[PDB]
Design a protein around this ligand. Structure first.
Ligand SMILES: N[C@H](C(=O)O)[C@@H]1NC(C(=O)O)=CCS1
Length: 351
């Protein structure tokens, strides 16, 4: 592998692992559209199983980039429109605060303060309807962004209704299979458990807990090889042969709202490149400016998403104009700034 890539990667990641005490880690750099893989440490400390290019990590909220692309493919299919009212696809949501909240607001966390988490007591379709009917918005729709699994989670579940398919089945057949992500899962099958890393939280081995709208907001598990293929797909959507999927990827990198230097896509978040690295909190409410109409995917962007579960920390970033990207998967949820700093330190060296 080119020594320049070898070197910047190891010189950046080795100290990161040491400083953050990460038990195991996998990295992919995509350089001029080819992937280069790196692994360190342990998928399972007790059983002494190393991280390999086959090891499954919990992506946590990097899963939202798969939800946003599946929603983009459903739009491209003419199954849904982002301008549609939520109640078009859930006419049981009759409470009047729902008037004016569209699928775009759900997808981009702008519905008016839906909360970060669906409560752990919500366990049935019935409980779910009750939660959403009782929610009282803090703000009118389309005025402030508040990152929320209950917002993009509900977008994912509604976006697949016209198809007739479960969310998992729609993701499997419309995204994972076409892109050859054959070791990417919403539910890890028994056959694949030997490759499923443990996460580590305060030194204990943990896996993500089941919860309502989990698949949609934070429940995908993948390998470093499939995540490198996901980054290639998102850097070069025109190479993708399925027309609605190619389109869906483009829709998910469109710029819908701006807060500060950041633009909100569907799952993906974007800044203009070159991106000041210092530009790149339990609840952060920010007023947003609508981009009217959304800007189609900008090639000169830093496009990224960070993800966590209790035991895992993931990061993906890529720059379309430079055909360059990175994926970092770890089995400890370590601070986001350390992820961004390491990524920028690698990509800026190679760019
Ligand atoms: N640490 C994660 C977060 O910070 O969003 C969450 N963790 C979990 C979990 O570990 O079960 C579920 C919802 S995402």
């Amino acid at each position: 592998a080119p020594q320049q890539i070898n070197d910047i990667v190891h010189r950046t990641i080795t100290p990161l692992i040491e400083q953050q005490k990460i038990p195991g880690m996998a990295v992919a750099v995509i350089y001029q559209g080819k992937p280069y893989y790196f692994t360190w440490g342990y998928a399972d400390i007790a059983k002494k199983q190393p991280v390999t290019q086959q090891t499954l990590f919990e992506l946590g909220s990097v899963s939202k980039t798969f939800t946003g692309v599946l929603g983009g493919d459903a739009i491209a299919r003419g199954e849904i429109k982002l301008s549609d009212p939520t109640t078009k696809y859930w006419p049981e949501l009759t409470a009047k605060q729902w008037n004016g909240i569209t699928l775009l607001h759900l997808a981009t966390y702008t519905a008016g303060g839906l909360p970060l988490q669906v409560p752990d007591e919500v366990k049935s379709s019935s409980d779910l309807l009750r939660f959403y009917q009782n929610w009282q918005p803090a703000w009118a729709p389309g005025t402030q962004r508040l990152y929320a699994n209950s917002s993009i989670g509900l977008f994912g579940a509604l976006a697949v209704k016209p198809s007739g398919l479960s969310f998992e089945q729609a993701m499997q057949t419309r995204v994972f299979q076409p892109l050859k992500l054959n070791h990417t899962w919403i539910n890890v099958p028994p056959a694949e458990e030997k490759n499923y890393a443990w996460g580590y939280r305060e030194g204990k081995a943990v896996h993500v807990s089941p919860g309502a709208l989990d698949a949609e907001a934070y429940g995908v598990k993948s390998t470093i090889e499939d995540m490198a293929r996901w980054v290639q797909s998102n850097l070069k959507p025109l190479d993708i042969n399925e027309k609605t999927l190619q389109q869906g990827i483009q829709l998910a990198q469109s710029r819908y709202w701006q807060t500060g230097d950041m633009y909100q896509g569907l799952g993906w978040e974007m800044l203009d490149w070159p991106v000041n690295p210092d530009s790149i909190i339990a609840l952060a409410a920010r007023p947003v400016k609508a981009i009217t109409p959304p800007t189609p995917a900008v090639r000169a962007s830093w496009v990224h998403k960070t993800g966590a579960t209790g035991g895992f920390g993931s990061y993906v970033a890529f720059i379309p104009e430079k055909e360059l990207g990175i994926v970092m998967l770890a089995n400890k949820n370590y601070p986001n700034p350390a992820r961004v700093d390491a990524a920028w330190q690698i990509l800026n060296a190679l760019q």
